[PDB]
Amino acid sequence: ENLYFQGMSVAHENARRIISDILGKQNIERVWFVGCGGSLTGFWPGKYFLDCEASKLAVGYITSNEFVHATPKALGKNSVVILASQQGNTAETVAAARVAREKGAATIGLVYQPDTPLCEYSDYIIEYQWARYPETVDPAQQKAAYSLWLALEILAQTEGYAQYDELVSAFGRFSDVVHGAQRQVQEDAQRFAAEWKDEKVVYMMGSGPSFGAAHQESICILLEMQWINSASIHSGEYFHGPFEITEPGTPFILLQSSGRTRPLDDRAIRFIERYQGKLQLIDADKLGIQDLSTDVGEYFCGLLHNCVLDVYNLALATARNHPLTTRRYMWKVEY
Amino acid sequence: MSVAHENARRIISDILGKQNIERVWFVGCGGSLTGFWPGKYFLDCEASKLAVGYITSNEFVHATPKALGKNSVVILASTAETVAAARVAREKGAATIGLVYQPDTPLCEYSDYIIEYQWARYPETVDPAQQKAAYSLWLALEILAQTEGYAQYDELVSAFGRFSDVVHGAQRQVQEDAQRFAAEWKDEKVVYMMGSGPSFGAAHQESICILLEMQWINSASIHSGEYFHGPFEITEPGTPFILLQSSGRTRPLDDRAIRFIERYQGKLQLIDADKLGIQDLSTDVGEYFCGLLHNCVLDVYNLALATARNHPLTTRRYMWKVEY
């Protein structure tokens, strides 16, 4: 018999070393995901995985400055606090890492820029990859991807996870699925941009693994990068107040998921179409989630939507003559 | 004792005689989920060993946490999907608490304990301590007190004793401002709700259950901390924000938001719990009552707005009218 020796994702190996090192020094009884805006919603994939799969863990998900100011008494020696910041200096995320460390928690800091202030209070540092679409990097090494890698490792090294190998090889297929999906949506994205360029209010929707993506699109793209009024509505929540807003032409972008919460999404689709809402459907299952894994591909829906949306976002920004880098406040005034 | 207090005490002692309480989930839809924010926030702040979940009913049904089990309590309020969530909870071995307005209603069937809360349509009022969202805090107080212990138990129970008075004082206080608000806000097409810490659930609730549902005004909720990481770029003169400002620890997130909104001439309606009598509740634990106060204070602004807009709050085009 010939012996086979496998390799490992950069993100897989980083995640795995960090969590082993931490377990050698404490228990992992509680995790917090802590950050601001996109640097909090980037943790949704891991949050969702653990909420679904971990039986022993208590999992938190909190905006940095709230964590700093109203610190949970549950934070301590056997907690892990995972923080993200792009340029590594969001003062409240740095203070969150400081407070976590003062409380005795292990801190994992995700940064794009190394030697940035978040690093000072990060026991472990991950330099995730990032580029501005149409420039690309390895999707398995992007900020949101690391939420799922770290989640996988926390679960596997504390409770075990029968589908570990399945998810690791799903992640090995992820770059091909992302590239195939982005290519597949070019035409639709163009048609979207031309037809949606004049909307002043857009509602983002999703459920389960895709809900973070929906919220992120809402707060980080539509409000932040386009100045379009927006809310995110959980597909399940839609029918308990929000849907009363719906009339012919009310714009909804639904980020539909594979797997268990899909019927939530299908329920919304039927209703939005029955009442002639302006619906842009982006369906993970049509864009090759089934190619990742028939078992655990539900957990990659948010990550896939984040990537596929880059295409629609550029198309819309060009149609609206509003570059995604437009700001009137951020990086411009003090606040 | 308050009847709400004795109800919560009796329920949680009974459960603890039969299982442990290692995990709590708050499960509901819309305002029957936001109603749990007061207890959720309290537990997130005060409980060191409890795992606390907060989940819309049909997602709890379709993607049930593996963590759900014999030493879990699932607390629900009322909706076939919340009934189904109670069924799933019980089927998994979790104890179930159902908050209901009317008895014999479908959620009762899968609820090990049923709490008939108090509700009335403003200006008709009811005991604030027996309202749906109040019970979230009562139940949370007792989960924590009967398991880990709570050093401010009596200070919070006496706070709760004074809460009816603070609510009535606050509702009287805002009468004139509410009329001014309605006159000035009746033509707005988009309203952002804002809050932090204990008042965030109340902000979200106004947004989804009042502005969208009962007024057909476009709206999103924004956490006061999240504002400055994307949402704030929507701000320009006249952008409508209703900030439910909190007392206590997160107040500085709200002050930061107020300085910014005012500097770029947002149309700001400020409703401050510390101006409406949270200082009279306690000095220690009063912060935990801010969401509850906001819920009540907003009833006044909501009626006034509904009147100025000739849009009754009971107006619906879909709910209780079509199938969905």
Element (H, E) at B3: helix B3-16
DSSP B181-233: HHHHHTT-SEEEEEE-GGGHHHHHHIIIIIIITTT--EEEEEETTTGGGTGGG
Angle at B33 between CA B30 and CA B39, to 5 degrees: 150
Q: Is B6 on the interface with A (CB under 8 A)?
A: no
Task: For chain A, positions 35-54, list CB contacts with chain B under 8 A.
Answer: 36-40, 51-54
Residue type at B58 in one-letter notation? N
With CB atoms and an 8 Å threshold, state whether B208 touches A242.
yes
Q: A91 Cβ partners below 8 Å, 6+ apart?
A: A117
Alpha-carbon gap: A194 to the closest alpha carbon of chain B (Å): 22
Q: In a 3-state reduction of DSSP, which class is residue A58? A: strand
CA–chain centroid gap for B259, Å, is 26
With CB atoms and an 8 Å threshold, state whether B231 touches A223.
yes
> Which residue of chain A is at minimal alpha-carbon distance from B58?
A236
CB B231 within 8 A of CB B243: no
CB B208 within 8 A of CB B201: no
User: What are phi and psi for residue A94, nearest 5 degrees?
Assistant: -65, -45
Q: Is B320 on the interface with A (CB under 8 A)?
A: no
With CB atoms and an 8 Å threshold, state whether A246 touches B65.
no
With CB atoms and an 8 Å threshold, state whether A237 touches B30.
yes
Residue type at A59 in one-letter notation? V
Burial of A162 (0-12, 13-18, 19+ CB in 10 A): exposed
Q: B178 Cβ partners below 8 Å, 6+ apart?
A: B300, B301, B303, B304, B305
Domains in chain B (CATH in brackets) are: 2-151 (3.40.50.10490), 152-188+283-309 (1.10.10.2240), 189-282 (3.40.50.12570)
| Cβ neighbours around B48 below 10 Å, total | 13
Q: Is B208 on the interface with A (CB under 8 A)?
A: yes
Q: A69 Cβ partners below 8 Å, 6+ apart?
A: B197, B249, B250, B252, B253
User: Which among B45, B56, B231 is the nearest to A219, CB-wise?
Assistant: B231
User: What are phi and psi for residue B116, nearest 5 degrees?
Assistant: -85, 95
CB B287 within 8 A of CB B260: no
CA distance A58 to A66: 18
Q: What was the experiment behind these coordinates?
A: X-ray
Burial of B62 (0-12, 13-18, 19+ CB in 10 A): buried
CA distance A297 to A163: 11
Nearest to B251 by CA among B177, B199, B193, B192: B199
CA distance B229 to A327: 12
Q: Is A194 on the interface with B (CB under 8 A)?
A: no
Chain B residues whose CB is inside 8 A of the A37 CB are: 226, 229-230
Burial of A248 (0-12, 13-18, 19+ CB in 10 A): exposed
Q: Which residues pair with A129 in a beta bridge?
A: A142
User: Which among B196, B230, B317 is the nearest to A223, CB-wise?
Assistant: B230
Q: Is A324 on the interface with B (CB under 8 A)?
A: no
With CB atoms and an 8 Å threshold, state whether A69 touches B249.
yes
> What distances in angstroms separate CA A229 from CA A75, A192, A273, A277, A299, one per listed residue?
36, 17, 22, 17, 29
Q: Is B256 on the interface with A (CB under 8 A)?
A: yes
CB A111 within 8 A of CB A142: no
Token representation of residue A274: 């029955």
With CB atoms and an 8 Å threshold, state whether A329 touches B232.
yes
User: What are phi and psi for residue A230, nearest 5 degrees?
Assistant: -160, 150
DSSP A21-57: HHHTTS---EEEEEESTHHHHTTHHHHHHHHHH-SS-
Helices (H) and strands (E) in chain A, counts: 13, 9
CA distance B230 to B240: 16
> Which residue of chain B is at minimal alpha-carbon distance from A37?
B229
Strands (E), chain A: 30-35, 58-63, 79-85, 106-111, 124-127, 201-206, 229-234, 251-256, 278-283
Q: Is B233 on the interface with A (CB under 8 A)?
A: yes
CA–chain centroid gap for A73, Å, is 27
CA distance A288 to B127: 54
Question: Do the bridges between strand B218-223 and strand B190-195 make them parallel or antiparallel, or are there none, so unpaired?
Answer: parallel
Q: In a 3-state reduction of DSSP, which class is residue B321? A: coil
Q: Is A160 on the interface with B (CB under 8 A)?
A: no
CA distance A65 to A85: 13
